[PDB]
Structure formats: C-alpha cells, structure tokens
Scaffold this active site. Structure first.
Site, PDB file in Angstrom:
ATOM      1  CG  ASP A 123      14.661  -2.378   0.082  1.00 17.41           C
ATOM      2  OD1 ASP A 123      13.996  -1.809  -0.853  1.00 17.41           O
ATOM      3  OD2 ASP A 123      14.402  -3.530   0.527  1.00 17.41           O
TER       4      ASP A 123
ATOM      5  CE  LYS B 204      10.365  -2.669   0.137  1.00 17.83           C
ATOM      6  NZ  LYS B 204      10.079  -3.488  -1.059  1.00 17.83           N
TER       7      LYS B 204
ATOM      8  CG  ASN C 121      11.942  -2.655   3.643  1.00 13.50           C
ATOM      9  OD1 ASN C 121      11.299  -3.702   3.724  1.00 13.50           O
ATOM     10  ND2 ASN C 121      12.922  -2.519   2.765  1.00 13.50           N
TER      11      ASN C 121
ATOM     12  CG  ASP D  73      14.242  -7.242   3.828  1.00 10.75           C
ATOM     13  OD1 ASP D  73      15.391  -7.481   3.398  1.00 10.75           O
ATOM     14  OD2 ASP D  73      13.208  -7.750   3.339  1.00 10.75           O
TER      15      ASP D  73
ATOM     16  CB  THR E  31      10.906   0.461  -4.224  1.00 10.19           C
ATOM     17  OG1 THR E  31      10.616  -0.824  -3.732  1.00 10.19           O
ATOM     18  CG2 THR E  31       9.655   1.040  -4.788  1.00 10.19           C
TER      19      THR E  31
HETATM   20  C1  2NR Z   1       4.327  -7.292   7.125  1.00  7.10           C
HETATM   21  O1  2NR Z   1       3.156  -7.400   7.942  1.00  7.10           O
HETATM   22  C2  2NR Z   1       3.317  -7.600   9.287  1.00  7.10           C
HETATM   23  C3  2NR Z   1       4.540  -7.740   9.920  1.00  7.10           C
HETATM   24  C4  2NR Z   1       4.591  -7.855  11.308  1.00  7.10           C
HETATM   25  N1  2NR Z   1       5.807  -7.994  12.013  1.00  7.10           N
HETATM   26  C5  2NR Z   1       7.062  -8.263  11.556  1.00  7.10           C
HETATM   27  N2  2NR Z   1       8.164  -8.449  12.306  1.00  7.10           N
HETATM   28  C6  2NR Z   1       9.152  -8.610  11.334  1.00  7.10           C
HETATM   29  C7  2NR Z   1      10.520  -8.861  11.469  1.00  7.10           C
HETATM   30  C8  2NR Z   1      11.285  -9.010  10.320  1.00  7.10           C
HETATM   31  C9  2NR Z   1      10.721  -8.881   9.053  1.00  7.10           C
HETATM   32  C10 2NR Z   1       9.353  -8.628   8.903  1.00  7.10           C
HETATM   33  C11 2NR Z   1       8.712  -8.541   7.545  1.00  7.10           C
HETATM   34  C12 2NR Z   1       7.621  -9.328   7.197  1.00  7.10           C
HETATM   35  F1  2NR Z   1       7.067 -10.106   8.151  1.00  7.10           F
HETATM   36  C13 2NR Z   1       7.039  -9.327   5.953  1.00  7.10           C
HETATM   37  C14 2NR Z   1       7.554  -8.485   4.980  1.00  7.10           C
HETATM   38  C15 2NR Z   1       8.626  -7.655   5.269  1.00  7.10           C
HETATM   39  C16 2NR Z   1       9.189  -7.665   6.544  1.00  7.10           C
HETATM   40  O2  2NR Z   1      10.160  -6.789   6.938  1.00  7.10           O
HETATM   41  C17 2NR Z   1      10.550  -5.767   6.024  1.00  7.10           C
HETATM   42  C18 2NR Z   1       8.596  -8.507  10.068  1.00  7.10           C
HETATM   43  O3  2NR Z   1       7.238  -8.296  10.226  1.00  7.10           O
HETATM   44  C19 2NR Z   1       3.421  -7.837  12.061  1.00  7.10           C
HETATM   45  C20 2NR Z   1       2.197  -7.712  11.431  1.00  7.10           C
HETATM   46  O4  2NR Z   1       0.995  -7.627  12.085  1.00  7.10           O
HETATM   47  C21 2NR Z   1       0.999  -7.710  13.507  1.00  7.10           C
HETATM   48  C22 2NR Z   1       2.132  -7.604  10.040  1.00  7.10           C
HETATM   49  O5  2NR Z   1       0.904  -7.499   9.412  1.00  7.10           O
HETATM   50  C23 2NR Z   1       0.359  -8.716   8.891  1.00  7.10           C
END
Ligand code: 2NR
Length: 302
Positions: free
Chosen positions: A143, A145, A148, A161, A181
């Site tokens: 996966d 992209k 991720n 992920d 994707t």
């Molecule tokens: C996806 O957008 C953000 C994610 C993070 N941080 C974050 N730490 C994570 C640990 C595990 C998974 C995710 C995650 C997620 F939070 C959303 C979608 C996908 C993800 O991982 C592929 C994580 O996301 C931090 C952010 O801003 C500080 C984001 O912007 C809103």
C-alpha cells in the site's frame, strides 16, 4: 492432565484511558484519532488511535486488523511506526500507535506540486530501508502512496498502515489479492498472476515518479483504463529528470518482476548501490543522522 478451572487476572487497557482530541483522518479500515493517555506511566502522552467498528460483521477487515497488529508487534525499525497498545471491546478493535506530528507526505507534495531530486532521494532512501526490513520478515507492504508516508517532528519518515499488507510470503509463495490504490499497483498485481516483495519495488518507482513530477506515470480516465495502462507500461519520460533518476525509473518499471531492480539475488542492495543514491551514507541514514530536507510575540519594552 486435569484442567485447573481458574482465571488469570490482568488490568486491561480500555478506550476510556485515552481522551479523544480530534479525528486525524481515515486509515485502511477505520478512522484514526489523536488521543491523550489519561492514566499510568505514559499519562499526558499523545497517540494516534485507529478504531475498527462493527468488527464482528466486517470479517475481512478484522483478519487484516489482527495481521496488522501482528506485523507491528514483530517490527523494530527507525522508519516503521511503533504500536503501544492493542485491545478490543464488543464490536470494536483499537490500535494505539505513535502520533506522527509532521503529518503525511501527500499534504507536503500537494502544496509543493513536486519535490526536488535531493528531497526525493532522502524520502526514498529511508523508505527503501523500511521496505527491506518488511521483506526480510516475509511481508509485502503493497500500500505505498504518499498518504501512507508519515513524518515525525524532525522530518524523518514512518510507514504506519499495514491493513492492506501481506505476511508469510517466502520461498515460492505468492499473494493474489487485488488491494491498494490502482495507480501504484505492479502489473503482476493488476493481471492477478501472483505477486511477491518485488511488487513493492514497482510501487516505489511510481511513488518516485509522482514525487519528482507531480503526476502519476500510468493513469487513465477511470480505474479500468489505468489498469490496462499499467499492463502496457508505456512511460512518457519528463525531460527535466536527471540521467540517474531516469535510469532508476526504467530499472524499476520492468513488467516482469524477475527482471525488476531489487528482485535479483542481492535484493535491496541493487537499489542501494544505484547511481541515484550514490551520495547516501546508508549507515548514517539508518541511525537517523541525515538531516531531513524539510522540518515539518509582538510586545516589546527593552
Ligand atoms: C493524516 O493527517 C495527519 C496525520 C498526523 N499524524 C499521524 N500519526 C499517525 C499514526 C498512525 C496512522 C496515522 C494516519 C492517520 F491519522 C490518518 C490516515 C492515515 C494514517 O496513516 C496512514 C497517523 O497520522 C498528523 C497530522 O497533522 C499534525 C495530520 O494532518 C491532519
């Protein structure tokens, strides 16, 4: 031997021990939330909580959530997310992971349109070590992209992920699923003929091309056209790409996975020694000693 009818006692991690702060986004099978630990030794710590709802009915998402948990417990790498807790309630599964403060690479890519070759070389170099670690454990990531690829406060990457990944792929075993994707899928994934770790190196090429140009190499008007365009693999090479970048892309975009860079007997070493990565000190990189290219009051009376 006669069974002793007694039960072991344990203080179980529960979702009530994590204060819900905000929704971060949408993962492979559920929402990811920013949470704050309320009690215990790690009290006040921020984490990302991934939640799988109606877990009893969603059988395919449940088996993959368990596989994701198992992968995370096994892995120990600087560019792979750490799992802190895993627990469940009736019809809900939870994964408590590091909260990556820098957001994802897609947000950066969309803002900048494309990255410099120096930035791409950095991101792909950390990614190649993470992918190789997964491959050494019999895992196909599948996966890739930019959504991720997460960034920490320093700007180093993390793969987080594993919902769509594949375990136990060794010797002559192949995977046959069609997940991920479409634009990043290797031809062998698209034509359903079976795929192994070499499919990740085709995806690595797509990610490289997108980061360097701001566009996808193989894409049509709809998912069905993109699929046949991946099978044809007729690549239009942008003329602002360096000879080193053009060599790497052509060596990764081999439709036959047996002939792809990284698929030979030396595995990842074929990628590490490519001219595109010649300025990379891979030991310093693993040690997080390479500075990332990007790191993610009015009153006066002296
Ligand atoms: C996806 O957008 C953000 C994610 C993070 N941080 C974050 N730490 C994570 C640990 C595990 C998974 C995710 C995650 C997620 F939070 C959303 C979608 C996908 C993800 O991982 C592929 C994580 O996301 C931090 C952010 O801003 C500080 C984001 O912007 C809103």
């Amino acid at each position: 031997a006669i069974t002793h009818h007694v039960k072991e006692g344990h203080e179980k991690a529960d979702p009530s021990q994590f204060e819900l702060l905000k929704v971060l986004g949408q993962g492979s099978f559920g929402k990811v939330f920013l949470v704050k630990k309320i009690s215990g030794s790690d009290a006040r710590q921020l984490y990302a909580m991934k939640v799988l709802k109606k877990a009893t009915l969603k059988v395919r998402d449940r088996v993959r959530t368990k596989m994701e948990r198992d992968i995370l417990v096994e892995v120990n790498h600087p560019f792979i997310v750490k799992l802190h807790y895993a627990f469940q309630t009736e019809g809900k599964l939870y994964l408590i992971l590091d909260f990556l403060r820098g957001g994802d690479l897609f947000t950066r890519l969309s803002k900048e349109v494309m990255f410099t070759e120096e930035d791409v070389k950095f991101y792909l170099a950390e990614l190649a070590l993470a992918l190789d670690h997964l491959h050494s454990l019999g895992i196909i990531y599948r996966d890739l992209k930019p959504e991720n690829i997460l960034l920490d406060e320093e700007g180093h990457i993390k793969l987080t992920d594993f919902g769509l990944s594949k375990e136990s792929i060794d010797h002559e075993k192949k995977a046959y699923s069609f997940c991920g994707t479409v634009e990043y899928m290797a031809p062998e994934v698209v034509n359903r003929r079976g795929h192994t770790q070499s499919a990740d190196w085709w995806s690595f090429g797509v990610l490289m091309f997108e980061m360097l140009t701001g566009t996808l190499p193989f894409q049509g008007k709809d998912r069905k056209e993109t699929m046949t365009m991946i099978l044809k693999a007729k690549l239009g090479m942008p003329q602002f790409l360096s000879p080193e970048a053009q060599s790497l892309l052509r060596m990764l975009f081999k439709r036959n996975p047996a002939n792809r860079l990284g698929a030979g007997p030396d595995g990842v070493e074929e990628i590490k020694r490519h001219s595109f990565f010649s300025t990379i000190d891979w030991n310093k990189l693993y040690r997080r000693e390479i500075h990332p290219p990007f790191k993610p009051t009015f009153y006066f009376d002296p």
